[PDB]
Every structure is written in C-alpha cells, then in structure tokens.
Symmetry: C3
Subunit: 318 residues, 3 copies
C-alpha cells in the first residue's frame, strides 16, 4: 500500500507558451485519482497551489524571464513537497513547466538528502543562467540543483533560498535527443551519466534501466525522485507539449521505465510536467497526452501490463 | 502449397459493442481470397455462417450476457471447423468476437488430440463465468477449454456440449497488456506461459517466438491453432476494434509472429477476430484494420517481407 | 560556433527527375542552413519505348558529370531527388572512386521488370543479363556483388529475390532488423563492406525505407518500415566511419501530401537524414563548446 500525495503546480512562467498551467486539471480530468485509488493507494490531493504573484519582475541580465515569479513559486512549492515527504507520502507534483523541479527536488532533499534523480526528458534542462539562449527557466532547473555547478551559476533574484542538493553522480538522464552545446559540455565535463535515444536504440530500455539502477542504487537503497517530462515520449504519443522533438520514447518504453521505478520500491517523489492541453490541435490530442500522463503516474505506483497490481489469491467455485 | 478453408463467423453476442459481426465481410472485401490464391493456396470457401438466433436469452445470475446464443453459435461453428479439419484443410475462421474460439478450438481438438494454441491478444480471455466483472463471454473463452479449470467453471445454459480439450502447458499467450486480477492469478497459478508486451520489450519478438516454440513443439511436432485477436496490434494500426489498448504490437512484430508460425509448417487453424469496422472514425480506419487482418492471414500462409513466396527458376537471357 | 568535432566538405545538387518538387521541398525545410550549422565547407551546384529510356539516360548523363566534378574536387556529394532512377548517374559519376561500396536503404531492391531497376545497370554480374538501352551505352558496371548491402527491404519482387539469392548479395530486410536490431545490422554491414579495408561509401537513401507514418509524401509507400530512430542510427553510424563520399536523398514527392503536416514532416525527415550523415546526433556533441562563462 503506497501513500501518495498529489500536488498541482500550475507553473507557466518557466517558459513562454501559455496553457501548461492547465496540465494539473487535464491530468486529474483524465482520471488520475480513480486510477491511483484502484491500485490500492492511500491518497491525499493538495489540489492546485495558488502561488504568490510577483507583478514587478523584470529580466535578469536582459535575458532571464520571470526570475522572481519562478523563484518564489518554487520556494513555496518546496515547503509543500517537504511537508508531504515528512508526513510519509510519495509526492506526485503535476506540472506546469519543468522549472517546478527546482522546488520539488529542493523540498524533497530537505528530508531525503541521500536522494537520487532519474530525469526522463528529450532535454537536459541544464543550461546555466549564463548559457541559455532562450532565457526560459524550464531549460535551466538542473543548473541550480547541481553541487558541482555552483561556481558557474549566478545568484538570481528570488533564487537565493536554493541550496544545491544533488551531486553529478546522483542524477541520470533518460531519453535525451535535443541537447544544447553548453549542456553537452556540462554532461561530459561533470561526468553526468545519461542514456540518450541513441543509447536506448543500442542497449534497449531493459539494459538502460539496469544500468541506471547500477549507477544510483548499486551501493545502497536511496529515495528515488523521478522527474518525468511528457516530451520524453515521441510527439505522436504526447502532442500537447511545448517543445516536441521527433524520435522519442515509445509508449512501451515509457511504461517500462515507470514499472522498473515501481519495482525498486524506492520511489519517493515524482514530477509529471510539460502537459499543455492548449497546444493540442484537437481535444482528442489533449486527452491522448493527459491519458499518457496518468499511465506514467499509475505505472510508477503499481499499474502493470500483466494485471499483477492487486492481490488475488483464490478462485470462486461453483 | 497449402489447403486452406475459410469460414465466416459473423457473431457479436460475446460482447456489447455493435458491429463486430461485419468483420468477416470487411476482411473478405479487403481481398483475402485473392491474396491466398496468389500464394498458391488450394482454397475451400465455406461462406459466412448464419447463426441460429436465441430470441429469449437474457442476463444470467445478474452477470452472464447472452449465454444461450454464445453456446449455440459455438456448437454450430465447432461442427463446420471439425468438417474442414477432417477434410484436410488448415481452417481460417473470420470473426466476429473472441468467444468464437470456444467453437474453433473445440472443433479442431475433435481431430487433433495433441493440438497446441498460440493466443495473440492484448487480453487473456480467461476469466471464468464466476470471476468475470463484465459478464461478456469474449473475455472468458479459454476458461471453458482448459482442463485444469473444469472444477472452477459453472454449467452455463447452452454450454453442456463443451468438453475441456487443452492443458495449461499447451497454450502460450503473446501480446498481453490488459489482464484482470483473477486472470493474472489463473496464468501464474496454473503455470500458463505468456509473453506480455513487457516480455516483448525485454526479450524482443525473435526470442519470444523461439521460446514459444520451445515450450509448445520443442519435444514433438503438433498441430498449431493460432487464435489472433486484431486488438493485439497497437490501436494506431488496428483502430476498428471494440476493446483497444494502447502500447500494442507493431506491424513488424505482428508479421514476424505470423511468419514464424508459417515457418513451423504446423499451422492447422487460425482465428482472426474482433475486427469491428463500425467503430472506425473513417472509411480509411476500417480499411487499414481490414488490410492488416488480411496481412496476418497471408503471412501465416507464406507471405514474406523478403519476397520469396513465389519461386523464380530462370532469368531471361539476351 | 567556431569549433566542431569534425569538418567535412559537402556538395549539394538538385535532380528533379510531383517528385520533381522534391529538391525544392528539402531546400525550403532549411537544408543548406543545417549543413552550415554543422561546420561543413559547402558548395551548392543548384538545381539541374524499348520492348522514358532517352530522357532518363540523358538527365542521368548530366548528373553523372556534375557528381564526377564535385567528388573530383574532394566534396562529399549530396543529390536531392527526384525519383531513384538518378542513382545510375550519381553512382556512375562517383565511380569515375572506383573502389566505392553502396549502402542501399529502401523498402525496394530496385534490382525482368513489370525507378525500380537502377542496380541492374550498375552491377557487374548482371551485365550479361541487361540489354543495350537507348542512351545507356555510356554506362559501364562499377560495383561487384560483395560491394552493395541493402537495408530496409520489405517489398521484393520474385525475380529480384532470385537475383539477391543466387548472386550472393548480402542484405538486411525488415525481418532481419526485427531479429538483430539496427545496432547489430550496422556492425555486420561494416564487417562485410569495410572489414577487409577502408572504402568510399555511397549511401543511396530512398525516403520510402521509413514507415509511411514518418515519410508519407513518397511514391510507393510500404507499411512496416524503419522508425525515425533506426534511420538516424544508420546515418550516424555511416558518419562514425568517416568514409561517407556520396549520398542520395530520393523519392520525396510533395504532390502526394494530403496535408501541410504530411508535406513538412517528409521534407524535415529528409533534412534530418542528410544532417545526421555529416555529424548531427541525438546527444549533440557535434558542436564543440570550449568553456562555461563565469558570473
Ligand atoms: N478489459 C477487456 C475484457 C475482455 C476483452 C476480450 B477480447 O477483446 O480479448 O476479446 C475484460 N477482461 C472482460 O472480461 O470483459
Ligand atoms: Mn524538461
Ligand atoms: Mn523536455
Ligand atoms: Mn480476445
Ligand atoms: Mn482482445
Ligand atoms: Mn528506391
Ligand atoms: Mn523505394
């Protein structure tokens, strides 16, 4: 019996495309709670958080957009995640853009300092505020969290509260296929392990999961933080997303990652981000993406493709 | 060269979605007979059976749907299949819902004491009339056929003619992804071998086919009954079906299963079920599903990806 | 960007043999910009019955002399199609490099006929089986049986199957990829073609080798093709040898598109294959970043 807390983080200021703030409601509408309930989960829904707005919030170094707004909302979200983690709940945060991982990972690390991160995404999201070309904070969350990158990251307004909480050996990426040249340099120079789409093509997702766990939990059991960007899946499967990139995970591969995460029994927090129902060309495309998000979450807590989630031990007789 | 019999079974009373009775007409219209002719098949067309309706056949024990109609249609179907097999043909039955495997497998076992079954489906179709939640008989056919379950299956009206004819070690499932808790218990408890979509994700379809044949025909040659539900394919490939489940077989995997079955030279009967042209959103969706059904059957009788079905003896010289 | 993992010299030619709208569709999808972004030294050449053997044979003679000039100057020649018949011209022109090996990526063997016969005119062992066509006398066979490897085969005609089987032409059909996986297929392909010695590689890529969901705007689409990932993998491994000498990107037919999304997706895919053949990858790393800025 897993105790699962659901937190809606209708965060959109980490990027420029509107509608990602409607991701939590779309996921709940696709039957998230009914699905987790059927798995036997003990649920708590915090509903959607109302983040303190920052009306006077100008560009940092004439590039970084909404720093105070993103920094403050993450500060507040980190308090909610920390509380849920303290109360014994596996914390599911529904996005919202991927800048929310600053708050969920920060919050989680307060009570789980030995956590490890499995980052599932088409993107590395590891640009520093000095390497970003877009100035979108959803493309930089990992830079604020990485201990080894601290001397390369300037102090941004609203971001001072953040204490880097993950080391380069404690994060593994899966699904990479659109990596900026500064991000590629960071991954190689700081020895951050990753399994790009090319590594999945060669090894197969089973070997990718085995190797990920060898790297992270090969020495001891640790709390796992699964940060899952819906754009890790091929755009044909997850169209309702801001930055789609062709040649992503199949439905089967995404289910396989989540099932392996469930099988460890170590999942402590999960982010499901970048579902933007507004970017779907049709209502069915929006529902398809939202149904996929529920499937990743439910598989992370026991949903299988073999029907082995529920205890059944005796057949009825005539 | 193969002797192949074709039987149309326009039957829908094993489920609640209207239209699956039009599956045989849709498959025939897709050019099935012309395709089998082009492969050099000696063909016998038994036409499309008209099933004796049961006007008074309502809900049994507040659960079982249409038992008298399903039992009778299967009794009639078993006699036609028995005729085709005893005449010496490899029996192709076009569905119609998956409750029709009661008739095809019963009819086939009347001549093949050592028959084995390869069941390709998103579903196990092995609930008993006591474990079913829906009461739909297309989700229960294997329970009536399996010897090990005889003491778990109640006597339904119209089912007294059925004799269990297969052992738990004589059926292998491929493609499973939507299994009920009692069905998972039955599969594990009785040691029925299955390769779910997760097993295919891990092993690959080559190893799945090798292991299937090792389990079934590794000790001795045996007639093979291929019970193929079109919903084993991903819904993007087979949209015109009643219970679609995302994350199915690819076109390539489906053809590979069919090619490997052909390569044994032991195919004795094939069911191609659950094509429901009415559930397609367009004519092209219905046609794609029908064409896929024809490709499975043709590959099961020799159609290949390398174009080696037709023998070429001499190249023209100048 | 000033630093790159590798610098290649690349020549681009448009051969519009609605398949004629193919080179224009590829160009409009930003091909030149993409190759420039990879640190390539670019040279754009612009856009150029028996039993149309004259017109096909003529257009191919112009293409073969343009390809021969580009490869003579030391450029890796890229030809935008147009139908696959242009491969007679490009492989002949490139051969004028005699020890060239071919990697034919197609749903079809293109090798008795009923764009489906280019390999018959080029293969040495098939010379005593091919008749003297009008405006085809200038062609001499250049590639032997053990120098062409097919990848992606799924629609092979009975006389083609006999040719492949009896002339011992090694191939990896869709069924072979299903069994081995694309990694093993590339490892085995290179074991066959360059295991003995290094050789200029001719990659003739038909867009229909990919599944029709990915490349819908093509002439002869065949279901159950290569995924986007498999095709990129082929191109990346070809790049990783450091031997790519010529490449054809054929059968993009923008007049067969039933929507703008089907038109743009097919052209974008064709740009992706070419870019991956000259260094573009899923991991990045093609562009070399020196140092991180400090606050
Ligand atoms: N959720 C699927 C269904 C069975 C589908 C039968 B099939 O489509 O395979 O024929 C369920 N287990 C049931 O018992 O009603
Ligand atoms: Mn992300
Ligand atoms: Mn992303
Ligand atoms: Mn079925
Ligand atoms: Mn089924
Ligand atoms: Mn071709
Ligand atoms: Mn082709």
């Amino acid at each position: 019996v897993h105790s699962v807390a659901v937190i809606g983080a209708p965060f959109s200021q980490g990027q420029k495309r509107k509608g990602v703030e409607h991701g939590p409601a779309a996921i709940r509408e696709a039957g998230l709670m009914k699905r987790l309930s059927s798995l036997g989960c003990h649920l708590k829904d915090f509903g959607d958080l109302s983040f303190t707005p920052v009306p006077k919030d100008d560009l940092y170094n004439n590039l970084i957009v909404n720093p105070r707004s993103v920094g403050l909302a993450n500060q507040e979200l980190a308090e909610v995640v920390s509380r849920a983690v303290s109360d014994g709940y596996s914390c599911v945060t529904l996005g919202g853009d991927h800048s929310l991982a600053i708050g969920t990972i920060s919050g989680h690390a307060r009570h789980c300092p030995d956590l490890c991160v499995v980052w599932v995404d088409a993107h590395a999201d590891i640009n520093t505020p000095l390497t970003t070309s877009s100035g979108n904070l959803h493309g930089q969350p990992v830079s604020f969290l990485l201990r080894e990158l601290q001397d390369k990251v300037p102090q941004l307004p609203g971001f001072s509260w953040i204490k880097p909480c993950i080391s380069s050996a404690s994060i593994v990426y899966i699904g990479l296929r659109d990596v900026d040249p500064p991000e590629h340099f960071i991954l190689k120079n700081y020895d951050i392990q990753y399994f790009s789409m090319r590594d999945i093509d060669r090894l197969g997702i089973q070997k990718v999961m085995e190797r990920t766990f060898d790297l992270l939990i090969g020495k001891r059991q640790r709390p796992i933080h699964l940060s899952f960007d819906i754009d890790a899946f091929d755009p044909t499967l997850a169209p309702a997303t801001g930055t789609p990139v062709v040649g992503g995970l199949t439905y089967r591969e995404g289910m396989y990652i989540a099932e392996e995460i469930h099988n460890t029994g170590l999942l402590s927090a999960l982010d499901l981000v970048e579902v933007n129902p507004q970017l779907a060309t049709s209502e069915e495309e929006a529902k398809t993406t939202a149904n996929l998000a529920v499937d990743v979450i439910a598989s992370s807590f026991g949903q299988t493709r073999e029907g082995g989630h529920i205890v059944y031990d005796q057949l009825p007789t005539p």
